[PDB]
Symmetry: C6
Subunit: 223 residues, 6 copies
Amino acid sequence: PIVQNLQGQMVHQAISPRTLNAWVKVVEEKAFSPEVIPMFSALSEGATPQDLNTMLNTVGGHQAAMQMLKETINEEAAEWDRLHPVHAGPIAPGQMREPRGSDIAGTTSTLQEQIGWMTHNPPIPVGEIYKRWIILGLNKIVRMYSPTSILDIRQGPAEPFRDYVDRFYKTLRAEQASQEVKNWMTETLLVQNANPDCKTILKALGPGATLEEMMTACQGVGG
Amino acid sequence: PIVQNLQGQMVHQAISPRTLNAWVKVVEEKAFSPEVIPMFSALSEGATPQDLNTMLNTVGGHQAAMQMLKETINEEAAEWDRLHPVHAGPIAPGQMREPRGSDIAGTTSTLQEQIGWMTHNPPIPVGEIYKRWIILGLNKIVRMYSPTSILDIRQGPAEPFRDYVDRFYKTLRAEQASQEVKNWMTETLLVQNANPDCKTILKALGPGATLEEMMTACQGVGG
Amino acid sequence: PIVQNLQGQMVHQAISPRTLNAWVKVVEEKAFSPEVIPMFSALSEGATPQDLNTMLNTVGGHQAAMQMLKETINEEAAEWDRLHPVHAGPIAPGQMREPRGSDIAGTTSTLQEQIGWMTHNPPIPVGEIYKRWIILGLNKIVRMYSPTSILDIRQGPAEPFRDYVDRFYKTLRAEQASQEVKNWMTETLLVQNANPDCKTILKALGPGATLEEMMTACQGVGG
Amino acid sequence: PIVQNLQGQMVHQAISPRTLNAWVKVVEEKAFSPEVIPMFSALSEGATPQDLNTMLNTVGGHQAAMQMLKETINEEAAEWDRLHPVHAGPIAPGQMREPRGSDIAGTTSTLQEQIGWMTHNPPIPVGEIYKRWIILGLNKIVRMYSPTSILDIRQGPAEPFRDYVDRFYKTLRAEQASQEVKNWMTETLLVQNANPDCKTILKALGPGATLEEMMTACQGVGG
Amino acid sequence: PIVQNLQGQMVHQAISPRTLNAWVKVVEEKAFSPEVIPMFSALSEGATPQDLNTMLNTVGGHQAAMQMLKETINEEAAEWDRLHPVHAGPIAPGQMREPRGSDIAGTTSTLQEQIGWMTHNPPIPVGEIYKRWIILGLNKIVRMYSPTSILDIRQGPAEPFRDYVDRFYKTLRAEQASQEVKNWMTETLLVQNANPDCKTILKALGPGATLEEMMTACQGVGG
Amino acid sequence: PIVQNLQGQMVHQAISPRTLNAWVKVVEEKAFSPEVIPMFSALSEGATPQDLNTMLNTVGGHQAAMQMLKETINEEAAEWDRLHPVHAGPIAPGQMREPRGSDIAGTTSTLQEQIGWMTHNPPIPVGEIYKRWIILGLNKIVRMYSPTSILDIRQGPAEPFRDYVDRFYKTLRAEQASQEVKNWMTETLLVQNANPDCKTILKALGPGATLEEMMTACQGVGG
C-alpha cells in the first residue's frame, strides 16, 4: 500500500503479517470456492504488484491452480504487450519508462519504479491492472473446482426447498457464463428440477414470481 | 471509511481484515438471528458502497438469503430511479453527476466518484442510502428464518417462566409488524398462553403490570 | 467515543469490533453476574448513545433482561421529561435544542445532534446520562438473577471458611440495598450463620474483628 | 492513563479492553500467586484511580480477597486522613482542593478532578498513591493464600534438588517478612532440611557457597 | 525497520513480537517447505541486519539447517570481502566506513552504524544484501528437505490427475535448477509419467496444450 | 521504551501487555532452551530497567533460575561498583548523578532518573548495561538446564544423520565455551561419534568438508 511520508517521499508500507495469515488460512480452509475472489479483492486494496506476488507465492497448497494462474498471467501479459507497443526512443524530459507486460508484474520491476508509476500524475495504476489479471485467472480457477455443472442439480425426495435454493445458487455463482443466461437459468430450471410435489406447488404459483415468494410458498410444503 | 489526508485528498482506508473476519464468522455461526442487523449496522459505520458490497460478497453460506437480498436491493434501486428523475442536461459549472439507483450500489460506480459524492457540501450520503436498503432486505431475511409464528408459542408444563419470556420476546423481535401490535401482543398473549398455574397467578396480579413484576411473581412458582 | 479531527470538525469514532465482541462474550458466558456492571462501565467510556444502543442491541441471549432494561429506560426517560420541561419558544440565537427523554437515547436523535449536544460549552452529558439509566436497570437485572436471598446462606458441614466467605460476599454484592444494612449484614450474619465449631471459634475471637482476622482464625480449623 | 491532546487539554485515555481481559484472565487462572503483584504493577502504569477501581471491580471471583483489599484500602485511607489535615479555609487563588483519603480513591472524586490533580505542577500523584495502598493489601492477600509456612518445606526422599529449590524459593517469595531474615532463611534452612544424602553432600561443600554451586553439586546426585 | 523521527533522527523501530511469533510458528509447522522463502521475504521487509539476526536466532528447531545457513552466510561474506577491497586510508571528510563482509551482518556492526549506512545518500542497503545471502542459503535448505527428486514421481493406478499435478509441481518448485530445464520438465515428464489410460488421453490431446486443457481433459476420466 | 512527547518531554511508554504475555508464555512453555536468549534480546529493545525488572518479576515458574540470575545481577553490580568509583563531591553545574550498581538496576532508582540518564548527551545507556548483566546470567541459566554434556552424545544404530546433526548442534549451542573449541568440536567429534556405517562413509569423504556435504552424503545411507 502507498502512504505519504511526513516530509513526503511517497513511500510504501510493508504488507501486514495478519493479512497474509488471513489469506493463507482462507485459501487453505475454503479450497477454491467462489468467496476467494471477494476476499482477495478485499485484502489487497491499493497493494503494489510486489504485495500481490507476495500473497500469491505465500500459498503452499494447490500448486496446480497457482501454475494455471501463472500461465493466465503470462497470457494476459503477452496480450498487454501487443496493445501498447514500445515508444522506440530515448527518455523524454523528466519522464519515466512505460510499463511493459513483465513490468506490470514484479518480475522485471523494482519496488521504487512501481512506487513512481502509481504516484505520478497522470497515474498508471499498475496495481489494479495486475489485480484484474489475477482475478481473471482466479475466475477459471474457481470454475474448475466446482464438482457440478448447472444442468445436473435436482432436489431430492425428502429435502427442504431452502437447501435446494442454496445449492442451485451456489452452483450458479460458480458457473459464471453471462448475465442473460444466469437469469434464464434462474427463471426456468429452478422450478423445472424440483420435487414433483414441489413442482406441483411451484407451477401452482406461476411465472413472474420473486424468489422470496417461491421460498415462502414451499416453506414446509414437501416434508 | 472516509478519512482526510495529511495534505488533504479525502482518501479512503481499505476495510480492516478483522471486520470482515468478524462479519463472516457472525453470519456463519449465528445463522440469521435478529442480532445480525445491529451487528451489520455497527461493523459498517461510514463505509462506502464498495465496502458494503465487499461484506455482502465475502460470505459463502446461505446463498438464497443473499440472492433475495440482491433482489430487494434491485427493487429499492428501481424505486429510487422513479423518485428522482434525470436532470436532462450538460454538466453544471463545477458539479458532479447525480447518483442513479445503480450508482448508489457499487455496480456502476467507481470508488473515486463515491468518495467525492459523500464529501461535497451539501453531502449526498450514498453509503447511508445503501445501508438502509441492505437493512430493509436483511429484515425480510430475518423474518423468513424464524421457525415459529408469534401466535404459536405456549409455555410448557414443567418450564420456568424465565425461559418462556425469553422465547416469547425472541419471537417478538423476529416477527416485526409494527409497534402497536407488538405492545398488544405483549400485553395480551404473554399471560393467555402460559401454564395453567402460571395462568392463575398472572390472573391474580392483573392488568397493567410491568415485566419485572410478572417475572418476580412466578419466580420458583411452577416447579 | 469522541475523537478530534486534524482540521477540527468535532467528529465521532465508531467503536472497534473488538469491544462489541468482548461485551457480547461477557454477557453470553457470564450470565448476569455482578461483574457485568463494571465491565459495561469500562467498555463504554465516553461512548455516544448510539454506541450504547449498539452494545445493547447486539445482545441476542437473555431477551427478557433486555426488555426489562428497555422498560427501565422508558420509565427513566418519562421521569426525565417531567423534571425539565420544554422551553416553549423559537430557536435562540446560535442555540441547539434541549434534549428530551427520547433525545437522550438514540430513538429520536441523529448522531450529529448527539455530537453537538455533548461537545458544546457548557456541556450536556447525554452519553453519561444514558449510561446512568442503563446501569440503574442493569442493577435490577443483576438482582433478579441471583438464585439466593442473603438470609438463606449458611456454611456447610465440611467446608472451608474461605468458600463460605466467598459465597456470602458474592451474595452480598448481588443483593444491593444500602450501605449501613450491608455493614450490619457483614458484622452480624457472617458469624451467626456458620458451622457450630466455626460458631464457637468466631465467638472466641469476639466482636470488632476485621475480615483478615476472621479468615486467619479458621484457616485449617474445621477440617 | 494520561494522554496529551492535539490542542492540549490533558485528556484521559480509557483502558484498552485487552488489558482488562488480561488482568481478569490472570486473576482467574493463576489464582492469587505472588506473580499477580508484578502483573498489576505492569498493566496499570500511569492509570488513574478510576482505572484501578475498574480493574479491581471487573473481577467477580475471589470476593473474600476483594473485601479484604477494600478493608485494607479503607484503613490506609483513614491513616492518610490523619497525616494530612484539612486546609480549613476558602479556595486559594487559582488552586484546586487538597485530596482527602476518599478523594485519593474514586469514591469521592470525579474523573476531571483526578485528571487535574496529576497534571498540575507540582504534581500530586494520586494514581501512584492509590497503587501503593492496593499493593500493600495485595501483599497480605498473597501471604494468606500460600498453603504452607516456610519452615515446613523439606525435600522428599526421591526428588531432585532442583524441585526442592523451586518450592523453597516459591515459599520464600510468598512469605515476605524482611530482607535480612530472608537471607538467613536462605543460608540456614535450605541445607538443613534436605535429603540425608543431599544433607551430606551439602555439608561436604560447606558455607559461603552461591546457589549455583548448590545445584551444580547435587546435579544428578541423589537419584 | 526504518522510521523517521518527529524532529528527525532516522531511528529504528523494533520488530513487533507478532512478527517473531509468526515466523517461529511458520518455521515450526511448515518444516522447510518452499513457502518459507516468500514468508521470510515478506515478514522482513526493510529490516536491519540486527532484525534478520533476531529472526534467525529466535527459532530453536532444525539447528542443522541453521548451521548450514550460517555457513552459507560466512561463505557469501568471504566472497564479498574479495570483490570490494579495503579503502586503505584515513577517514574522508564527513564519511563513514565502507562495509566489510562481517560488517554487512550483525557480528561486527553496531545498530547505529547500520542505521547510518542505510539512510545516507547514496544508500548502502546492507539489509537487502544480508537478505539476499539469507535467501540463497534458505534455497539450499529447502532443496535438501524435499524427500523426492523430480524424476521419481509417477501417479498411481487409481488417483485423480489433480493430485498428480499438485505433487509434480510442488516437487518442481522444490527442485530449482533453472527456468529452461523447468519448462522442459513440464513439457515432457508431466505426460510421460502418468497412468497408462491417462497416457492415452494425454497422447490424444497432443503437444502444445496449456495446463488448464490438460486438467479439464482428464477431469474425472480415470476413476 | 523511549518515546518523545509532542511538545517534547522525553516520556516513557508503558510496556505492552502483549509483550509480557509472550515472554511469560515463552519462559513457561520453552523451559530454558537457548532460544530464550534471542527472544529476551528482542522483546526488550530499548526498554528501561523498570521494564526489564517487570519482565523478570512476571515469571512465576522456575524460581531457582530467577534467584541465581538475581545473584548474578548482584555480583555484576558489585563488580560495577569497583570499576567506576564515586566522584566524592557536590553536584556539578546542571549535572545529574552517576549511575551506581544498584542505580543501574531498578532497586535504587526512580523512573525519572533512568529517563534522564539515557536521554542526556552524552548518553549513559543504563538499560543496555542492565540487559548485558541479565544476558550474562541467563547464559548460566541455559547452560545448567541442558541435560547432556557435548562429549556424551552418540547417534544410535538406526537413526538418520539429520536427527544426530540436530541433537549435536543443539547441545553445541547449549554448551558455550569459546569459538575455537566450538569449531574443534564440530570438526572432530561430529564424525567420530556416528554409526559404524556412518563412520565408514564419513571417513570416505574425508576432512575439509562443509556440513552440506556430510548431510547429503549420508542422506538415506544408514537405513
